């Protein structure tokens, strides 16, 4: 009863977080809720192995300390959590050496495999998404009014190359090569406050792959403003080091 | 202007 990386078992809608839809449960099955040790959702994670969740940086500054943390899999309500889910207690935390917004968390204990529960594949190190290549990104996070508030969304957005996203109109130089930009340049669609650290996935053939973790924005769902992303390719060689040496 | 999307957000003045 075994589930391989990146195939979720409940096949996600098609939605063609501000924007977007929510999600069918448990179709984003690598999907983290990051959580204080008696606190709500603030930010999200990826899982992608039994043992590790990949999250964003940024989203441990409010303690140093794993035990200040906790991850909740399985989940599809922010609040009010289905009987089955997983809540599990941090052990250790890695931040990515050379200061990039990402960050992995071992677990205390492994995640269980389930039909709910199941990791993220990594790319190819190094891979560049293409331009316009339409991607998924998912969490908790404020939703500026639109609907789906206290329920995991997602939203389906065209990624937009480095070069482009950095004009002087768009994000002016901003975005680093190891960042990549996804979003309507027309706005109104966008990860946002809470989905920090979740994923920005692209389905590739028959799976869906880890391409980006949620990191940053000129606000959210802004016309002409972009969302950032960790580019989780440049970090592969990383993280793969330290599950092997912890 | 940039704002990292946790709660509370992280934010800096350009």
Same mark, same amino acid.
């Given at each position: 009863?075994?589930?391989? /990386?990146?195939? +979720?078992?409940?096949?996600?809608?098609?939605?063609?977080?501000?924007?977007? $839809?929510?999600? @069918?449960? @448990?179709?984003?099955?690598?999907?983290?809720?990051?959580?204080?040790?008696?606190?709500?959702?603030? $930010? =999200?994670?990826?899982?992608?192995?039994?043992?590790?969740?990949?999250?964003?940086?940024? /989203?441990?500054?409010?303690?140093?300390? +794993?035990?200040?943390?906790?991850?909740?899999?399985?989940? @599809?309500? !922010?609040?009010?959590? !289905?009987?089955?889910?997983?809540?599990?207690?941090?052990?250790?935390?890695?931040? !990515?050496?050379?200061?990039?917004?990402?960050?992995?968390?071992?677990?205390?204990?492994?995640?269980?495999?389930?039909?709910?529960?199941?990791?993220?594949?990594?790319?190819? +190190?190094?891979?560049?998404?293409?331009?316009?290549?339409? /991607?998924?990104?998912?969490?908790?996070? !404020?939703?500026?009014?639109?609907?789906?508030?206290?329920?995991?969304?997602?939203?389906?957005?065209?990624?937009?190359?480095?070069?482009?996203?950095?004009?002087?109109?768009?994000?002016?130089?901003?975005?680093?090569?190891?960042?990549?930009?996804?979003?309507?340049?027309?706005?109104?669609?966008?990860? $946002?406050? =809470?989905?920090?650290?979740?994923?920005?996935?692209?389905?590739?053939?028959?799976?869906?792959?880890?391409?980006?973790?949620?990191?940053?924005?000129?606000? /959210?769902?802004?016309?002409?403003?972009?969302?950032?992303?960790?580019?989780?390719?440049?970090?592969?060689?990383?993280?793969?080091?330290?599950?092997?040496?912890? | 202007?940039?704002?990292?999307?946790?709660?509370?957000?992280?934010?800096?003045?350009?």
């Amino acid at each position: 009863p075994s589930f391989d /990386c990146g195939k +979720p078992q409940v096949e996600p809608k098609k939605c063609p977080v501000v924007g977007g $839809c929510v999600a @069918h449960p @448990h179709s984003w099955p690598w999907q983290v809720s990051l959580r204080t040790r008696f606190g709500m959702h603030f $930010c =999200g994670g990826t899982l992608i192995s039994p043992e590790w969740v990949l999250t964003a940086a940024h /989203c441990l500054e409010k303690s140093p300390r +794993p035990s200040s943390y906790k991850v909740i899999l399985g989940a @599809h309500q !922010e609040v009010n959590l !289905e009987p089955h889910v997983q809540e599990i207690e941090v052990s250790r935390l890695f931040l !990515e050496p050379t200061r990039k917004d990402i960050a992995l968390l071992k677990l205390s204990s492994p995640a269980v495999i389930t039909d709910k529960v199941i990791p993220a594949c990594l790319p190819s +190190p190094n891979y560049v998404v293409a331009d316009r290549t339409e /991607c998924f990104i998912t969490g908790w996070g !404020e939703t500026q009014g639109t609907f789906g508030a206290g329920l995991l969304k997602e939203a389906q957005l065209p990624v937009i190359e480095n070069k482009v996203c950095n004009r002087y109109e768009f994000l002016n130089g901003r975005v680093q090569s190891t960042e990549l930009c996804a979003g309507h340049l027309a706005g109104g669609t966008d990860s $946002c406050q =809470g989905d920090s650290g979740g994923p920005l996935v692209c389905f590739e053939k028959d799976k869906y792959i880890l391409q980006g973790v949620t990191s940053w924005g000129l606000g /959210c769902a802004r016309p002409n403003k972009p969302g950032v992303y960790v580019r989780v390719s440049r970090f592969v060689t990383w993280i793969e080091g330290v599950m092997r040496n912890n | 202007g940039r704002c990292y999307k946790s709660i509370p957000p992280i934010c800096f003045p350009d």
